C-alpha cells in the first residue's frame, strides 16, 4: 500500500529505517548514505565476478599418477639418407635422376672433383642414355626398393628382455623416405606394454647405418646430407609420424639411452580453452591428432592444386612423377606455407598423450668388445666405430604425469559469489528483487 | 500458530506472499511457481558444489623462489663394468666364475674365437682346477676388491673451485657393483653447499674409466657389456642410489656439463592427493623416499623367500652365494616383478626434493692439451681419447622451483558457496531451517 | 525501545525466538545454544578465509597458445678459448702476459715439458724482453684483435633456408672474450621471425673452431682449457648474454639439433608474488631482466671499489689494466660473491620470455661427404673430424607455452565467502551490524 507501509514489512535491510514512521531527522540520512553506498559497493564488486566468469578462466592441476602396466610409445625412426646408393638403377636415374641431386640440368653429371675412380665408374654406366629404352616409373616403388632395408640395418632388437623381430617393424613414408615404426599398434597388432623401468625393460635396438651406402657428394647442392646417423620421433600410436618436424637424432658409435616420461595432457573445450571438442574423424586417418590434421591439410591441397599426392601422403591418389615435382608440387608447398598459412589451422584435441625425453650418451664399443663385434657381423674394426649405434628407449618409473585444466569458476561458484555479497551488502535475494517488482506493479496502477 | 500467521512473520522470502491473508488470486500461484522453482534451482546447484567438494580437488601453485646458499645434490656414479679384470683370481673364478659370464656350464671356457694370446693366457692359469684348494668366499668381499678403485679412476675432482678428495667419495653397492657417492651427507659429514652458478661453481671430476680393465667378451652371452663410459644418477642425500633405474650416462672423451635445477615438490595427503602422510621410518633406512621403500620392498622379500640378501641390499643378513643366486635369488626376482607386482606398492611422500638435468657435451681434449695430458698421467695418446672424461654438475642460478599443490576447495569455501546461493535463492540460513522445524514441531502436537 | 520489542522486528534470525514475549521455557535455551554456537561456527570459519586472503595466494594457469609467426631467439655463442695463439704479440706478452697463464711470476716461461720445437720457438721470440720498447695497451683492444674472428670461423650460416651473413653476427664481450650474437635485434635491426618448425626452418651454422689456434698447455695452471668446442646460451633479445652461467655447449664433429620451445612466463607483483613491478630502467641497459640487473650489480661495484670496469662490462668507464686485475679486480669479485652476496639481490621481472632446449646429436661427416668437405675449404681429412661442427636451433611447432599466475582469491571472492557464510549462519549483513549498532546507540542514552 503505502511506501512507509511497504518498507516496514519487506526483506531488504535498509528500508526499514529510511522510510520509518517518524519525522525527518539525522538518522534518515545516515541510513540513506549507508544504504546508497552499500548498494554501490555491491554494484562494482558483483560486476567484477560477472566479468571474471565471462572470461571463462581455468587453472591447471598437475598430478603424478602411479601405475603398473604402461604402454610403450611408437619408436619411429629412419636413416638420414633418403635411399641407398647401390640400389639405384639406370632407369631410376632417368625418370628421377635430376631430383636426387646427382645430375645437372641437361641430365648430365656436375663437376666430378673429389670423386673416387671406383665411385664414379659405378655411376658412369648409369648415365649412358645411349639407345635407352626406359621402364615405367613410380616414386612409391622407388622408395620401396632403393631405401634402407630393415633386414640389413637392424642387427639386434629387444623389448623387455625378450627378442624382437624385423617383421614387427612397420614401414611408413616421410620426407626422408623409407621409415619404420616399432610398436605401431595398427593392422590389428595390440600395443605392447612394459612392467618395469630401467635401461633393460624398454626397447634396445642395435642398428647399422650403412655409411658405405650413402649418396657421395661431389657438387655443392642445395640439400646435400653431410651428417651420418638416424632421426627418431617418439609419439603415441594414434599420431602419424612427423620425423621431419618433431624428431630428435642419435649418433653412430654412441649408445644413447633416451629416458621417456609418459604425459597425459587434458585441455578444455571452448569457451574455456581451445581444443577439438568432438572426435573429428579425418578423411585419411581414423583418429584425430595435431599431426593427422596437418597432413590432411596438405593432402587435400595438393590434390586440388596438382591432381596427385606426394610419397609421404595418405589416401588413394596416384603419386606425382618428378615432372609434376619440379613444376607443380614444389612451387605449391611454399605457396601454402609462406603465403596461405593463415587459411589452414589445426586445433589440437584435448585428450592428448605425449612423451618427454631425457637424452644420455654412452660410447660403444669398448676395446674388450671391439674385436668381438668385428667378426660376429663380418665387419672391419674401422667400420664398427662409425656405423654401429644402439638406441634405448624406456621409462624411468611406472608412473605418468597428467596435466589437466580445471575450470576455475563455474556457474555454481558465480551464484555463491553473487549472493555471497548480495546477502552481505543489502541482504536481498532473487525473490526480494521480485518482491520490489511486486510492490512497484501495484503503485503504477494507483 | 496458524499457517497464515507463521508465514507472515518468518525469515523466508517467499512465504510472506504465498500464504497471505487474502483470497486465492493469480498472484498466489505466481509466487508459488517462482518459489518452487527457486527452491529447485537452489537444489541442483548446491548439490554441484557438495559433490565438487566430495571429489576433494586440488590445483597446483608453481613458484620460483630465489635463494643464496643451495645444497649440492649427491652425485652418484659408477663405471658400467661390474668389476675389474686384473683383480679376479683363481678362487674368484671357482665360487663365482659361471655367474660372471666367462665360463660354460661345466666350469670351462666357452668358444675362444676373437681372443688375444696375451688376453687368454692370463685367464688360462685362472681356470686350471688341478689340485685346487678353494678359499672361503663372500660376494661382498668380491665387490670390495675386484671393483673399480676410486684412487685409480679419479684424476682430479673439484668443488666450488676448491680441491676435492677420494676420501670424500663414499662407497655404495648397486647392480653395477662398486659405486661411489660424492656429497653423501651421511656418517656425520655435513652436506656441502654452493654460493654461485656457472660451470666452475659445481662439481668437476676428471675420471679414468680403465678400458683395458674391462671384461673381454669372447662368447655371445645374455649380459655382455659392449659400451664404455659411466652412469650417473643425481638425487638428494636422503634417497638411496638407484643408478640401475634413475641413472643417465656420460661418454669418454666428452666433457659433459650437466646443468641441474633444484625442485622442491610438495604433494597433498589423502583424501586430497596421494602421499605418505606420516614420516614412515623404514626398517633399513632412517628416512623414507620412493626408492628406500622399493629396496625395503625387495629386502624383506628375499629374506622371507631365500634366507639371505643380495650385495645391493641393506640390513644385516648374510650375503647369498652364487649357489643361492642361480637357484633361489634370480628366480625370485621375476616371480615378484612380473607375477606379484601388485602385492607391493610404494606411496611417494609429499615432501620430495628432485633435481632436473639439462645435458651438454664438449669434446675433450684439444690438440693444444693433447700431449700434456699424455705425459702428466703417464698415458698414451690413444689412451687419452677413449678413457679420459670429465663430468660437471652445477646449478644454473641460485633459485629453486617449487611445485606445491593447494587444496582448491576447503570447507570454508563450501560454506561460502552453500549460503552464497542459499541466501540468493530463498534467503534462508541454518536457523531458518531450524525455524521451520520449530513451527512444524508445534503443528504435530495440535 | 524494549529488548523484546527490538528483537521481534530486526533482521537477525535467532533473536526473534530467544527474546520472545513469553515466560522462560526450554525453547529459549535451545534457541540460545543454537545461536551462540552458530555465531561461533561463523567466527572460526570466517577467520579462515580472512587469513587465507591475507596470505595473498595464487595458482598457475598453463596454456599452449598456437601462433604463426614466432620470433627467433638470440643464438649467442663463443669458442671456449679466450683468444687465438697466432694473434698474440711481444707487446701483448708484456702488459698481459702473466694473466694469460703462459708465464711465470718473473715474466719468464714455466717448465717446457711436452712442448714442440715449432710450438716453443714461435713463443720464444715473443719473450725476449731485450731492449724492449713497449706499446700502449688496452684489454678491450686485445680482445678485439686476438680473439676468434667471425669471418674465419663460420663456414656457412643459414636461416629459414635463406642465406646468412657474418655482418649479421654482432660482437659482445663475456668472460670467454670475443663472443658473437646472431639475431641480436639491437642497432635498429628488426628481430627476425620464423614461419615453420623442423630442422630446416631455423638457424643452421657450420663453424670451424680452429683447434690449431688454441693455447698450448705446458704447465699445470689454475685455468687451463683442455676441452675443444663452443658454448651457447639461448635467450631473448632483451637479456644481455650470460654464456658463462646460462650456457650449454656442443661438440666438434657432431651436428647438434637444439630444439627450442618458446615460453612466455608471467609472474605476479607483490604482495601476491615476487616480481619487479615497474619497468626499472637500469643505468647501463635500456631494458630490465634478471641478467641485466646482475651485471649492473657488478659494474657499479667495481667502479666504486677499483675505479674501472672489466672487459665484459657495460658503461663508459676505462678498462682495467692487468696491474689492476691482479691487485684490485680479482680480489674484489670474491669479496662480493662470497662475503657480501646478501647486499645485492635482483628481483626477476614478471614479463619474462624464456626458451627451453632439447638436445640431440648427429655425427658429421659421413664418408660420402668426407672427401668433399676436405677440398672445399682446403682442409685435411684429420682436420675435418675435430674442427668442423654444425649447430641447428629451431622450434618444434609454431606454438608457445605460457606459464601465468592467476590470483586465486581476490577481494570479490572474499566478500562472496564472508557473507556466503554470514548469511548461512546468522543471516546478517553489513546493515544488520549497523542495525545492532543503531539499537545499542539508543539504549546507552536511556
Ligand atoms: C577424454 O578422456 C577422459 C578420461 O581421461 C574421458 O572421460 C573423456 O570421455 C575423453 N574424451 C574424449 C573426447 O575422448
Ligand atoms: C665377409 O666379408 C668379406 C668382404 O670383406 C667377404 O669376402 C667374405 O666372404 C664375407 N664372409 C662372410 C661369411 O660373409
Ligand atoms: C614438509 O615441509 C614443510 C615446509 O616446506 C613443513 O612445514 C612440513 O612440516 C613438512 N612435512 C613433513 C611431513 O616433513
Ligand atoms: C709409465 O708407464 C710405462 C709403461 O707404459 C712404464 O714402463 C713406466 O715405468 C711408467 N712410468 C711412471 C713414472 O710411472
Ligand atoms: C606484461 O605483458 C602483458 C601482456 O602479456 C601486458 O598487458 C602488460 O602490460 C605487461 N606488463 C609490463 C610491465 O610490461
Ligand atoms: C691450401 O693449404 C695449403 C697448406 O696446407 C697451402 O699450401 C695452399 O696454398 C692452400 N690453397 C689454397 C687455395 O688456399
Numbering used by the authors:
A (entry chain B), B (entry chain C), C (entry chain A): 17 to 462
The authors write:
Upon activation by rapid exposure to low pH, homotrimeric ASIC1a channels open, exhibiting modest Na+ selectivity with PNa/PK ~ 7.8 and PNa/PCa ~ 18.5 and subsequently entering a long-lived desensitized state in hundreds of milliseconds. Here, we present structures of cASIC1 solubilized without the use of detergent, using SMA copolymers, in distinct conformational states at low and high pH.
We propose that the limited resolution of the resting channel structure, while presumably impacted by cryo-EM grid conditions, including thicker ice than for the pH 7.0 grids, may also be due to structural flexibility inherent to the resting channel conformation in the absence of divalent cations, which serve to stabilize an expanded acidic pocket at high pH but which are incompatible with current SMA-based purification strategies. In accord with previously solved structures, the homotrimeric ASIC1 channel resembles a clenched fist, harboring domain-swapped TM2 helices. Both the desensitized and resting channels adopt closed ion channel gates, as evidenced by a constriction between residues 433–436 within the upper third of the TMD.
